[PDB]
Design an enzyme around this catalytic site. Structure first.
Site, mmCIF file in Angstrom:
data_model
loop_
_atom_site.group_PDB
_atom_site.id
_atom_site.type_symbol
_atom_site.label_atom_id
_atom_site.label_comp_id
_atom_site.label_asym_id
_atom_site.label_seq_id
_atom_site.Cartn_x
_atom_site.Cartn_y
_atom_site.Cartn_z
ATOM 1 N NE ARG A 56 -3.850 0.298 2.520
ATOM 2 C CZ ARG A 56 -4.683 0.214 3.652
ATOM 3 N NH1 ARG A 56 -4.287 0.779 4.524
ATOM 4 N NH2 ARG A 56 -5.377 -0.805 3.656
ATOM 5 C CG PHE A 61 -1.239 10.395 2.621
ATOM 6 C CD1 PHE A 61 -1.838 11.177 3.727
ATOM 7 C CD2 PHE A 61 -1.998 10.650 1.520
ATOM 8 C CE1 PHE A 61 -2.841 12.021 3.335
ATOM 9 C CE2 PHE A 61 -2.948 11.530 1.287
ATOM 10 C CZ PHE A 61 -3.514 12.161 2.280
ATOM 11 C CD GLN A 64 0.056 -0.169 5.825
ATOM 12 O OE1 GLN A 64 -0.353 0.905 5.589
ATOM 13 N NE2 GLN A 64 -0.721 -1.102 6.346
ATOM 14 C CG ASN A 103 -2.415 0.133 14.831
ATOM 15 O OD1 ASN A 103 -3.292 0.363 14.409
ATOM 16 N ND2 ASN A 103 -1.386 1.115 15.275
ATOM 17 C CG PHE A 114 3.044 3.894 8.333
ATOM 18 C CD1 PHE A 114 2.595 3.227 9.716
ATOM 19 C CD2 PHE A 114 3.054 5.271 8.276
ATOM 20 C CE1 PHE A 114 2.303 3.942 10.708
ATOM 21 C CE2 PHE A 114 2.522 5.930 9.418
ATOM 22 C CZ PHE A 114 2.173 5.195 10.518
ATOM 23 C CG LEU A 123 -1.507 8.424 11.366
ATOM 24 C CD1 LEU A 123 -0.452 7.723 10.236
ATOM 25 C CD2 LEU A 123 -2.799 7.738 11.288
ATOM 26 C CG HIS A 127 -0.561 4.352 13.601
ATOM 27 N ND1 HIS A 127 -0.493 2.950 12.909
ATOM 28 C CD2 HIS A 127 -1.578 4.820 13.516
ATOM 29 C CE1 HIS A 127 -1.884 2.982 12.381
ATOM 30 N NE2 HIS A 127 -2.450 4.086 12.774
HETATM 31 C C1 LIG Z 1 -11.165 8.132 3.733
HETATM 32 C C2 LIG Z 1 -10.257 7.554 2.809
HETATM 33 N N1 LIG Z 1 -8.919 7.238 3.503
HETATM 34 C C3 LIG Z 1 -7.849 7.953 3.823
HETATM 35 C C4 LIG Z 1 -7.779 9.453 3.360
HETATM 36 C C5 LIG Z 1 -7.981 10.432 4.333
HETATM 37 C C6 LIG Z 1 -7.660 11.923 4.135
HETATM 38 C C7 LIG Z 1 -7.499 12.148 2.824
HETATM 39 N N2 LIG Z 1 -7.289 11.043 1.857
HETATM 40 C C8 LIG Z 1 -7.319 9.934 2.005
HETATM 41 C C9 LIG Z 1 -7.439 8.902 1.066
HETATM 42 C C10 LIG Z 1 -6.218 9.040 -0.008
HETATM 43 O O1 LIG Z 1 -8.648 9.131 0.067
HETATM 44 C C11 LIG Z 1 -8.748 8.138 -0.777
HETATM 45 C C12 LIG Z 1 -6.801 7.326 4.588
HETATM 46 C C13 LIG Z 1 -7.350 6.099 4.594
HETATM 47 C C14 LIG Z 1 -7.121 4.949 5.338
HETATM 48 C C15 LIG Z 1 -7.881 3.836 5.113
HETATM 49 C C16 LIG Z 1 -8.934 3.652 4.567
HETATM 50 C C17 LIG Z 1 -9.536 4.837 3.949
HETATM 51 C C18 LIG Z 1 -8.578 5.811 4.079
HETATM 52 C C19 LIG Z 1 -7.248 2.650 5.978
HETATM 53 C C20 LIG Z 1 -7.508 1.241 5.663
HETATM 54 C C21 LIG Z 1 -7.168 0.222 6.143
HETATM 55 O O2 LIG Z 1 -7.647 -1.271 5.678
HETATM 56 C C22 LIG Z 1 -6.224 0.203 7.010
HETATM 57 C C23 LIG Z 1 -5.937 1.524 7.783
HETATM 58 C C24 LIG Z 1 -6.175 2.461 7.209
HETATM 59 C C25 LIG Z 1 -4.942 1.562 8.748
HETATM 60 C C26 LIG Z 1 -3.599 0.649 8.472
HETATM 61 N N3 LIG Z 1 -3.858 -0.875 9.073
HETATM 62 C C27 LIG Z 1 -3.910 -1.816 8.227
HETATM 63 O O3 LIG Z 1 -3.534 -1.647 7.288
HETATM 64 C C28 LIG Z 1 -4.059 -3.198 9.068
HETATM 65 C C29 LIG Z 1 -2.982 -4.224 8.973
HETATM 66 C C30 LIG Z 1 -1.893 -3.500 9.591
HETATM 67 C C31 LIG Z 1 -1.436 -4.694 10.481
HETATM 68 C C32 LIG Z 1 -2.658 -5.115 11.010
HETATM 69 C C33 LIG Z 1 -3.320 -5.544 9.687
HETATM 70 N N4 LIG Z 1 -5.320 -3.663 8.630
HETATM 71 C C34 LIG Z 1 -5.882 -4.412 7.340
HETATM 72 C C35 LIG Z 1 -7.082 -4.687 7.447
HETATM 73 C C36 LIG Z 1 -7.846 -3.909 8.719
HETATM 74 C C37 LIG Z 1 -8.861 -2.820 8.177
HETATM 75 C C38 LIG Z 1 -9.506 -2.527 9.641
HETATM 76 N N5 LIG Z 1 -9.295 -3.750 10.694
HETATM 77 C C39 LIG Z 1 -9.686 -3.659 11.892
HETATM 78 O O4 LIG Z 1 -9.560 -4.733 12.397
HETATM 79 C C40 LIG Z 1 -10.733 -2.608 12.405
HETATM 80 C C41 LIG Z 1 -12.218 -2.873 12.324
HETATM 81 N N6 LIG Z 1 -10.233 -2.378 13.865
HETATM 82 C C42 LIG Z 1 -8.665 -4.775 9.686
HETATM 83 C C43 LIG Z 1 -6.603 -3.378 9.264
HETATM 84 O O5 LIG Z 1 -6.523 -2.624 10.416
HETATM 85 C C44 LIG Z 1 -2.378 1.181 9.102
HETATM 86 O O6 LIG Z 1 -1.871 0.988 10.285
HETATM 87 N N7 LIG Z 1 -1.849 2.483 8.271
HETATM 88 C C45 LIG Z 1 -0.425 3.024 8.963
HETATM 89 C C46 LIG Z 1 -0.875 4.270 8.607
HETATM 90 C C47 LIG Z 1 -1.500 5.031 7.406
HETATM 91 C C48 LIG Z 1 -2.796 3.997 6.971
HETATM 92 N N8 LIG Z 1 -2.425 2.460 7.117
HETATM 93 C C49 LIG Z 1 -3.382 4.428 5.846
HETATM 94 O O7 LIG Z 1 -3.239 3.493 4.819
HETATM 95 O O8 LIG Z 1 -3.803 5.633 5.617
HETATM 96 C C50 LIG Z 1 -3.948 6.236 4.271
HETATM 97 C C51 LIG Z 1 -4.346 7.436 4.450
HETATM 98 C C52 LIG Z 1 -4.215 8.396 3.039
HETATM 99 C C53 LIG Z 1 -3.294 8.200 5.216
HETATM 100 C C54 LIG Z 1 -5.750 7.870 5.008
HETATM 101 CL CL CL Z 2 -5.536 5.251 9.240
#
Ligand code: A1AZY
Ligand code: CL
Ligand code: GNP
Ligand code: MG
Lengths: 166, 170
Positions: A56, A61, A64, A103, A114, A123, A127
């Site tokens: 990802r 941003f 990951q 997480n 990430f 965050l 995190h």
């Molecule tokens: C509103 C649009 N949207 C914008 C946004 C906002 C504002 C403007 N523009 C946008 C976007 C550019 O518009 C399009 C951001 C964003 C982030 C998510 C979804 C939509 C978003 C997101 C989706 C995920 O699936 C997970 C996460 C975020 C957090 C991510 N965890 C995981 O991947 C974990 C794994 C890591 C180890 C454990 C397994 N998993 C995968 C499966 C699940 C999902 C939830 N599960 C649960 O069990 C819940 C029920 N408890 C299981 C999970 O937790 C994580 O730690 N990080 C690190 C930090 C960054 C974050 N990812 C990420 O990607 O931020 C993207 C961004 C762009 C910064 C924010």
């Molecule tokens: Cl997030």
């Protein structure tokens, strides 16, 4: 650093060498989380990051990665077991190069992590920050260009090799 | 002529929002979990004899990005509020979605359908009657679906279009 270990990732793009990113791991302030990342980078426990994917990448941003158990962004595991608790929130997501744990909510650190490419202050306190890019931020910037708004990468970005320096 | 509808799929992570959407669009069941950030799809269909262009916004099940969430709710015309019948917390979350949609859109009457997904699984924790009573209290339809077997998938989305049309008539 005189105290903090340095680890490296050799990054590949569709198998081809892109470059090396090295990280200072803040064992001085976040020892348990830093040690997990160090040991996963050397593979010394019998598993770790070598071969795994940055699945990802969202430009503006973060990059990951770290899921070496399910290989699909849902998995990973730590050297302490499947998950470990949030160690502390001493350090913040202050800008590009910050290395922080991914997480699934409180106390679900495993191996996914990430690398920030911008400040991600929302965050903070959610995190655990445990390191920073030391050399090769330009390689992270190159990786970031293969990402997209929904995180899917246009070519497969992997950790071709990894280990500990110094 | 035709008419376009902006449908937004919301609900807790893992409940099957994407699997339902992919069944509607691609007619196959995604067995794997590919966690969503955000994806949009389009499909032309005929519902009650009237040609529709469906816009489907598949949202991530997350509660951290409220400015984006608010914009999703402002733009969307109808909401598929999905829980999983083997996930009680996801059902308990439902009322939060309805409260947020009503606030963002400044209305007590917003087209929505309550969807209880994963009805093929043998691990049910939310009774059908529980979900029916909640939907009745909201005055909205409730549909049990399985993205795996495709049961109820078309019905869930088409019912949402019917709800939007009923709202537009007022
Ligand atoms: C509103 C649009 N949207 C914008 C946004 C906002 C504002 C403007 N523009 C946008 C976007 C550019 O518009 C399009 C951001 C964003 C982030 C998510 C979804 C939509 C978003 C997101 C989706 C995920 O699936 C997970 C996460 C975020 C957090 C991510 N965890 C995981 O991947 C974990 C794994 C890591 C180890 C454990 C397994 N998993 C995968 C499966 C699940 C999902 C939830 N599960 C649960 O069990 C819940 C029920 N408890 C299981 C999970 O937790 C994580 O730690 N990080 C690190 C930090 C960054 C974050 N990812 C990420 O990607 O931020 C993207 C961004 C762009 C910064 C924010
Ligand atoms: Cl997030
Ligand atoms: N048995 C069964 N499994 C289902 C059903 N719907 C989804 N799943 C499974 O449940 C998991 C999560 O589904 P998914 O559609 O990705 O959930 P989501 O609500 O889009 N998650 P997110 O909010 O993270 O994007 C996947 O493994 C998927 O195959 C269903 O009706 N039956
Ligand atoms: Mg999804």
């Amino acid at each position: 650093s005189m105290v903090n270990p340095t680890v490296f990732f050799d990054i590949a793009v569709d198998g081809e060498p892109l470059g090396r990113v090295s990280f200072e791991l803040f064992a001085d302030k976040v020892p348990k989380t830093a040690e997990n990342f160090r040991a996963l980078s050397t593979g010394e426990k019998g598993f770790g990051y070598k071969g795994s994917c940055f699945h990802r990448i969202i430009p503006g941003f973060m990059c990951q990665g770290g899921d070496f158990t399910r290989h699909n962004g849902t998995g990973g595991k730590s050297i302490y077991g499947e998950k470990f608790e949030d160690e502390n929130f001493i350090l913040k997501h202050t800008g590009p190069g910050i290395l922080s744990m991914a997480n699934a909510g409180p106390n679900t650190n495993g191996s996914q992590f990430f690398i920030c490419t911008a400040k991600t202050e929302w965050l903070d306190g959610k995190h655990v920050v445990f390191g920073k890019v030391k050399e090769g931020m330009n390689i992270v910037e190159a990786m970031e260009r293969f990402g997209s708004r929904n995180g899917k990468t246009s070519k497969k970005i992997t950790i071709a090799d990894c280990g500990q320096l110094e | 002529s035709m008419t376009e509808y902006k449908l937004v799929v919301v609900g807790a992570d893992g409940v099957g929002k994407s699997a339902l959407t992919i069944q509607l669009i691609q007619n196959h069941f995604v067995d794997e979990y590919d966690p969503t950030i955000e994806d949009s799809y389009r499909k032309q269909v005929v519902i009650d004899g009237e040609t529709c262009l469906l816009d489907i916004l598949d949202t991530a099940g997350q509660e951290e990005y409220s400015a984006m969430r608010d914009q999703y709710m402002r733009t969307g015309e109808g909401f598929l509020c999905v829980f999983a019948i083997n996930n009680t917390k996801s059902f308990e979350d439902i009322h939060h979605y309805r409260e947020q949609i009503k606030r963002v859109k400044d209305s007590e009457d917003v087209p929505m359908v309550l969807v209880g997904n994963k009805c093929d699984l043998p691990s049910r924790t939310v009774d059908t009657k529980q979900a029916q009573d909640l939907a009745r209290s909201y005055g909205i339809p409730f549909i049990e679906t399985s993205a795996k077997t495709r049961q109820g998938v078309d019905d869930a989305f088409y019912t949402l279009v019917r709800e939007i049309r009923k709202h537009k008539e007022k």
